[PDB]
Amino acid sequence: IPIVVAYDIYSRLLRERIVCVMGPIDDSVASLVIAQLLFLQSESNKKPIHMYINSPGGVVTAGLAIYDTMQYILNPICTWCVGQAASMGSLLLAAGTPGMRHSLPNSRIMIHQPSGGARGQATDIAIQAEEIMKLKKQLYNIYAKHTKQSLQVIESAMERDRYMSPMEAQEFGILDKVLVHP
Amino acid sequence: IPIVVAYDIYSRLLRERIVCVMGPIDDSVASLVIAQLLFLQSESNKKPIHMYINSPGGVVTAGLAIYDTMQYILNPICTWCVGQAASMGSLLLAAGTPGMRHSLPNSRIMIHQPSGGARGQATDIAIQAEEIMKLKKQLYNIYAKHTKQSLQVIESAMERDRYMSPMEAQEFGILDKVLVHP
Amino acid sequence: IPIVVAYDIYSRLLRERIVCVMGPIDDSVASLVIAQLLFLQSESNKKPIHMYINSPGGVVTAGLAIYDTMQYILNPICTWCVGQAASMGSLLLAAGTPGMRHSLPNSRIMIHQPSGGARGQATDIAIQAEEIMKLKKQLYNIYAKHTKQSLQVIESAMERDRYMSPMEAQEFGILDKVLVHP
Amino acid sequence: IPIVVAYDIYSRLLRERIVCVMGPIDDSVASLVIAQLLFLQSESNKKPIHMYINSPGGVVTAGLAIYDTMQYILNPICTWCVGQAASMGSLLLAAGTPGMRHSLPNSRIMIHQPSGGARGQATDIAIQAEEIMKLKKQLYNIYAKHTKQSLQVIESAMERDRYMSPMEAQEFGILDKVLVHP
Amino acid sequence: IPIVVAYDIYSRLLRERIVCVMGPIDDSVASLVIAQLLFLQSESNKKPIHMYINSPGGVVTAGLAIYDTMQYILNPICTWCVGQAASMGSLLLAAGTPGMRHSLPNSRIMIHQPSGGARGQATDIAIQAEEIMKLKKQLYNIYAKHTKQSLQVIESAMERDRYMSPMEAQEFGILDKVLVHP
Amino acid sequence: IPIVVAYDIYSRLLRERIVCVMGPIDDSVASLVIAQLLFLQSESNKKPIHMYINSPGGVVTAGLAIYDTMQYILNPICTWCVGQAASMGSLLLAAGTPGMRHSLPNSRIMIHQPSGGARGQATDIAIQAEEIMKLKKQLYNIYAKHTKQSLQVIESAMERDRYMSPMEAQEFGILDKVLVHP
Amino acid sequence: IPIVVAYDIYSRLLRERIVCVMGPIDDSVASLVIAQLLFLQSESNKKPIHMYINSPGGVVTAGLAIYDTMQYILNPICTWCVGQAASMGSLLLAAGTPGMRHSLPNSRIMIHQPSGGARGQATDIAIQAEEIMKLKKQLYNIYAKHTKQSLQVIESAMERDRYMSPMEAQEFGILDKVLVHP
Amino acid sequence: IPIVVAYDIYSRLLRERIVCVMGPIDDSVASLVIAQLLFLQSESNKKPIHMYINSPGGVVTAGLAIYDTMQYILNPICTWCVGQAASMGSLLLAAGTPGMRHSLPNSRIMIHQPSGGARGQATDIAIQAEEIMKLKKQLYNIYAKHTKQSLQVIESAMERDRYMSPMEAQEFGILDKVLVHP
Amino acid sequence: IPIVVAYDIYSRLLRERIVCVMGPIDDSVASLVIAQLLFLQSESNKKPIHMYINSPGGVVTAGLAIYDTMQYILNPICTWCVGQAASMGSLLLAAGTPGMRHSLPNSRIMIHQPSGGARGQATDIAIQAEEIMKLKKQLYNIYAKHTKQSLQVIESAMERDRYMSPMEAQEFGILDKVLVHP
Numbered sequence A, B, C, D, E, F, G, H, I: 001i002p003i004v005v006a007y008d009i010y011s012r013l014l015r016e017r018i019v020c021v022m023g024p025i026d027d028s029v030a031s032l033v034i035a036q037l038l039f040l041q042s043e044s045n046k047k048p049i050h051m052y053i054n055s056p057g058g059v060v061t062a063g064l065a066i067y068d069t070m071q072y073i074l075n076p077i078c079t080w081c082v083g084q085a086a087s088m089g090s091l092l093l094a095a096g097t098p099g100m101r102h103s104l105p106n107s108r109i110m111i112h113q114p115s116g117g118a119r120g121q122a123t124d125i126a127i128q129a130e131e132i133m134k135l136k137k138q139l140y141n142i143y144a145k146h147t148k149q150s151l152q153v154i155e156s157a158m159e160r161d162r163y164m165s166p167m168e169a170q171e172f173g174i175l176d177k178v179l180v181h182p
């Protein structure tokens, strides 16, 4: 990591209210992002915060924690898609404030349904299957809230993997603008 | 394996209409047992067949195949518990013809509910959980048929592992007689 | 393997025109089954042959070779489901001559669509995807031929895993009779 | 870890009397949390301390040490559920001072009974089983103290895995308030 | 294995009503021994059978199956200690008919209590501990039956490992005669 | 391997002048096939020999040895495709005598160019590349000789993997007849 | 890494508006490069930025993110080929502003088509193959935009691996100048 | 590890004359603890030192070194049980100055006899067994000195593992006070 | 193993009352040797038996079982040292009947004391050390009985490894004759 005499490049970016969400999303990544967001709200609760996303997905609880923290703080949040947005990435991209969700021209967006596993006795397996079913329902409700589509459309579009270009995702309601130059 | 000039000990026993079910029950064991039963029925459909059981359990499909083959052939079948009859083994012991199920004085019998696993997408997990639920119902129905207990008693007694001595298993309905000498 | 003074149990069964198809289906299993079928046709081309099936599935080419050999020889063929007929196994069970397909009362039958993989350059991936798609079409045509269902019903019923009891499979057209006793 | 010219993000948060309990709970995590709590009490024994929880569980002794340290110091303690609270997490969340336990709207809470193992001679196994039973009784007593439920309800609700949404956990007595915005 | 033109050495010995129990005792060993005993009873139910023991112990269920089979058949049984008799071996040596238990002059005999393990939830651990305790009681009862000692003496002598020479074991009641020459 | 009292199934088939070429082709397979062909020619040099092929391919030298031995002996040779013929298999299938090459209705045939590797110093790499190029030329010449196609068509058709149904392969010149029944 | 009293050599180079893209291109490399580009634009949006490339290639999404960020910022960008430029390297080298793409005299440039893989059910395989085909189309469009060649020439030249010297790549349109001295 | 601008949390605690003994006890842990104790004595030989214990045990020589260093220095020492004090840990807890040994209300204390191993020739094994026996005698003497119990009680109570709550350990003589609040 | 038309070489040798004890001595070797000795005694109780030894040693219980069986049967026994007689082997060589122990001119004989190990709690270690001490005493008594040396000489000579030529071993009392030709 290069240094700027004495910062590092990511701390220098954080001085400009910029947070990076890169790679797969797990508990360490989620805790780091949440700490940065809380610190930025502590500095000022009226200035916008910019989040750059390049992720293939990750764990449901970590992404839901990030989403809930984003909805909690009072600052307006802008989301920028650079590269990839799959699973929670595409859920985070759509979670920015209306009118402030952007993508670069050569990005890919992917949506699909959650996956998991069960093990043990039959009673245990029943309990775990019920848990994952209601988790799927909750995720679909969040998607329907932020894309302004209907529940039937969301259920139809997420049975299998679905890929989109920025124009297709803008038509779907995941994005607002596709930008070429500042 | 010792030989009897030229048989082996198991073929010499099979000459006396004796089949041995020892160790874990899998597809190879099931196919061997079924082939032996078909051969013995081909030799004669009126003479009794003796089955010695010492097993800790195994796969559901193999044991159900053995049970179905046992119910299909016309010969009367005697079952003998030597050492252990746990899980699928305890299902086979109770499947002999009425009045012909025996145990040795120092044997242990164990009953419990089936186990498994699920993996994949949410739809896949739902399908697999439904399959294992109806498997459990079918097994409970077989147990209730052969022990003359009610369905509620069977469901209560198999929530956890249950261990029994030969007298307790005779009172439950899994056995008819506990023998010390010929 | 027990011996009958000097045969083995499977050769003694083959003396009664009985062939066993047990376990996963691969090239060795297919070659053994085909050799036995050719030998039995060599002995006599007018007597029936009985095939017992307990399999979870296997490779497409081996199962298609077995199916083609079954359709080639002139002998009538009876199929017996003991325990499990899943994936390729369920294709063989339905391939017996009409009026001669049987199952035991506690068996499970499963149907679903084929799976595979692709690797390499984009042109190679396109070629392999085309190959697997036409493989799926051929398998669906065989199923529609032998179950007397329509192609739309077969396509709808095989998108996901589908499990069946002997009565359900008899209603579908995979079986003719469910037998309890000889 | 990003730095603030010179702190790290977690030390900058600790300057605001904020402690993070993230990931599995073991001895290192417990010692770090306890050291931070003692330092914060040293700075001031009248100001509130905030604890953010996102954990799947861990070891009983470490969590009990954290709980005892929380009950020892004189400062009021607020607990915040972000993401997940299972095993000790759900025990720690309920251990905050009354009126100061919060959750985010999309969190999951899980409760169940403890697990372990025994090995060795029969006398050793008896001793270890007695120890784990006493551990279970002590944990149930703590839960009953802090949720205001009866012991029978606690024992009934923890035989199997139990999952809860924030409203359900608020009704159970684990939480006081579910918050959307500051 | 050397051959006697065509037998092997163990089948040649079995022609003289001699059964060898060597090495650790598991399910395969138990099934082989039981098959040989049943065959020898089939040949004649009035002639003595000789059993040579050199074993360090093994599994409880297999040894109890062997013991029950020995007590079931009508033939008198002689036991010969060559080298070692520990755990189940020392249980089998004492199980011969009175007046027919022998040892070689330089053998070692060892007695101790059983061992095991438990795993899982607290209820499971309680069930497993209860099972192993009643197993210990059953083994102690068998020892007291065949050695003519009191239960308190047996419990006192088996808390730790106890080693014995043939004269000490003869005084204890495990043996009848120590022989130097035929 | 089943036995016919005393042959094995493959020796029983060899008594009917049937040779099986199954699985991958390597030096052991080639040696066995060549030995069988020489023995069958020794028995009689005027009777036809039947070869059943189910292979995914293999090594060039072994397949070329089999091809040369097939062209050497004086007996007419029939080839039968059951299941699969890829790489050398498709080369072997086309090598039968004209009018005697058959396939089953559901078989797949595949053709492509050879593959290899080079290593070492630059001079060594040049030598090895020259060797593989002339190997390719020789294989193409054999294909052109036996299919009656032009060299340009063969080079065009084998740049990438090419798959074929029995009717397409009959049109190409690899086969003579597609048979459903004897 | 040597230090310049307190910088490191790469931070000292970054003080001169120099960014290094060395080794394989993955998500970490892409995020670091993008952060450096954003910081350099923050310092000044009118001064040129120099990018040195020595890479064998990498992942498509990371390289496309770097390319999109390069086209977004307003600064003129010079590209310098030192050593190797294969896959995305050659795509990045051609993406500099016209008249500002340079190479050293002994460098190698390579172009080819993308590669990947597919797995799962047939529907999944179809979806993934469609995705990789449209990815190839997008890459070809970018190449045709920046080299001023026609689409047919680009598709012809990328079927196999193609190697070029700096003069050949200058004639192709990937470069403007080959320099020996400043 | 969090920092306090510039200390770490453990150095900040050491500024308050607090030493932490956490985790298993080995030579590195012992050397660190002894160095801290010597430094604290060098700062002042009249002020109390506080030691917090959460350990499952460890090596005998390291713990005896810590014990001897504690008895050597002139400062009064307070011991605090948080979570766990087992094996060597329970020896250190009892080693504090009279009237200054505390525990938290939910801690567990465990006592038992030492363990080891021997290997080699018979003379070596005799020497090593003698060494471990006198080690046991020395440990028992230390326990009897600090708990004010008799040697017979100590030997009777340590044959097997013995578990204690803080009240039971206070009755035994290991502790002075159980505290809920400061 | 070569065959003599149909024996093997070892069975052909056993036809001449020759037993081979080669390689390390363990339970399988001991059981085979004992079975052969019992068979040879069954054939005739007055003819001599010849035993050829080439062994580096082994387990104490197996060798003591062989020694006890050797002293039990009534036949005279000749021992022949070919190559090596070390540890247990040297104990068997000296165990032949007086006047019938021979060696080849270039053999090596080695004597030393037994080795072992102990593990566990201190009481267990004491018990195991006592057991190995009495084992050593019993072995020394056997050596003193068969060599006609005093116990002090045996104790002095086996503290360390001791090597001997046939003449030295004859002087020590392990052998009677060193032979060059029949």
Ligand SMILES: *[B]([O])([O])[C]([C][C]([C])[C])[N]C(=O)[C]([C]C1=[C][C]=[C][C]=[C]1)[N]C(=O)C1=[C]N=[C][C]=N1
Pocket (backbone or CB within 6 Å): A056, A057, A058, A059, A060, A061, A086, A087, A088, A091, A112, A113, A114, A115, A116, A117, A132, A135, A139
């Ligand atoms: B995506 O592939 O990242 C996708 C999320 C999308 C549907 C919003 N991920 C998941 O569904 C993950 C996959 C996963 C499983 C196991 C470990 C890590 C990631 N699912 C879960 O995290 C999960 C957790 N609990 C239950 C069910 N699924």
Ligand SMILES: *[B]([O])([O])[C]([C][C]([C])[C])[N]C(=O)[C]([C]C1=[C][C]=[C][C]=[C]1)[N]C(=O)C1=[C]N=[C][C]=N1
Pocket (backbone or CB within 6 Å): B056, B057, B058, B059, B060, B061, B086, B087, B088, B089, B091, B112, B113, B114, B115, B116, B117, B132, B135, B139
């Ligand atoms: B027992 O252990 O024999 C028991 C059967 C009893 C309830 C009559 N066996 C099972 O429940 C087995 C356990 C197992 C799982 C996986 C591999 C091998 C054995 N269950 C199954 O075989 C099974 C199969 N399909 C679905 C669910 N469970």
Ligand SMILES: *[B]([O])([O])[C]([C][C]([C])[C])[N]C(=O)[C]([C]C1=[C][C]=[C][C]=[C]1)[N]C(=O)C1=[C]N=[C][C]=N1
Pocket (backbone or CB within 6 Å): C056, C057, C058, C059, C060, C061, C086, C087, C088, C089, C091, C112, C113, C114, C115, C116, C117, C132, C139
């Ligand atoms: B089933 O599991 O028996 C099923 C066949 C059913 C649809 C009639 N099998 C397959 O789909 C197999 C799975 C498999 C993959 C790889 C190795 C072994 C088995 N598919 C294939 O064999 C296959 C072969 N070539 C291309 C695609 N799929």
Ligand SMILES: *[B]([O])([O])[C]([C][C]([C])[C])[N]C(=O)[C]([C]C1=[C][C]=[C][C]=[C]1)[N]C(=O)C1=[C]N=[C][C]=N1
Pocket (backbone or CB within 6 Å): D056, D057, D058, D059, D060, D061, D086, D087, D088, D091, D112, D113, D114, D115, D116, D117, D132, D135, D139
């Ligand atoms: B949860 O799953 O984290 C749960 C705690 C809940 C009941 C308050 N955990 C446990 O019960 C743990 C599981 C575990 C076992 C072994 C290592 C780590 C974690 N149990 C224990 O820590 C434990 C310790 N001693 C005895 C029994 N159980």
Ligand SMILES: *[B]([O])([O])[C]([C][C]([C])[C])[N]C(=O)[C]([C]C1=[C][C]=[C][C]=[C]1)[N]C(=O)C1=[C]N=[C][C]=N1
Pocket (backbone or CB within 6 Å): E056, E057, E058, E059, E060, E061, E086, E087, E088, E091, E112, E113, E114, E115, E116, E117, E132, E135, E139
């Ligand atoms: B001995 O050590 O062989 C002894 C037998 C003696 C007490 C009559 N053996 C056991 O106690 C065995 C040890 C063992 C454990 C696990 C695998 C193999 C052997 N115990 C058991 O077999 C056993 C089985 N179920 C429960 C408890 N113990």
Ligand SMILES: *[B]([O])([O])[C]([C][C]([C])[C])[N]C(=O)[C]([C]C1=[C][C]=[C][C]=[C]1)[N]C(=O)C1=[C]N=[C][C]=N1
Pocket (backbone or CB within 6 Å): F056, F057, F058, F059, F060, F061, F086, F087, F088, F091, F112, F113, F114, F115, F116, F117, F132, F135, F139
């Ligand atoms: B096919 O895939 O089986 C194919 C043959 C076809 C062109 C008639 N096989 C080959 O080309 C084989 C692949 C292979 C490589 C290495 C080990 C085993 C198989 N090629 C060769 O055998 C080979 C040998 N020497 C040089 C070049 N290629």
Ligand SMILES: *[B]([O])([O])[C]([C][C]([C])[C])[N]C(=O)[C]([C]C1=[C][C]=[C][C]=[C]1)[N]C(=O)C1=[C]N=[C][C]=N1
Pocket (backbone or CB within 6 Å): G056, G057, G058, G059, G060, G061, G086, G087, G088, G091, G112, G113, G114, G115, G116, G117, G132, G135, G139
């Ligand atoms: B080159 O070899 O680096 C080349 C890129 C060129 C065509 C612009 N690379 C790829 O095509 C990579 C290869 C790769 C595969 C897997 C992991 C890492 C690298 N392809 C991809 O990244 C890719 C991604 N998704 C779909 C298809 N291909």
Ligand SMILES: *[B]([O])([O])[C]([C][C]([C])[C])[N]C(=O)[C]([C]C1=[C][C]=[C][C]=[C]1)[N]C(=O)C1=[C]N=[C][C]=N1
Pocket (backbone or CB within 6 Å): H056, H057, H058, H059, H060, H061, H086, H087, H088, H089, H091, H112, H113, H114, H115, H116, H117, H132, H135, H139
């Ligand atoms: B306890 O677990 O802390 C306990 C000490 C207690 C009796 C005061 N420890 C031991 O007994 C240790 C166990 C151990 C063995 C090997 C490595 C690490 C730990 N014993 C010894 O350290 C030991 C050392 N030398 C001889 C014998 N035992």
Ligand SMILES: *[B]([O])([O])[C]([C][C]([C])[C])[N]C(=O)[C]([C]C1=[C][C]=[C][C]=[C]1)[N]C(=O)C1=[C]N=[C][C]=N1
Pocket (backbone or CB within 6 Å): I056, I057, I058, I059, I060, I061, I086, I087, I088, I089, I091, I112, I113, I114, I115, I116, I117, I132, I135, I139
């Ligand atoms: B020698 O190597 O043959 C020798 C015996 C000699 C003194 C007459 N052997 C032993 O001392 C063996 C070594 C050994 C140890 C462990 C496994 C195998 C071999 N000793 C024992 O067998 C043994 C057994 N129980 C206790 C002590 N030693």
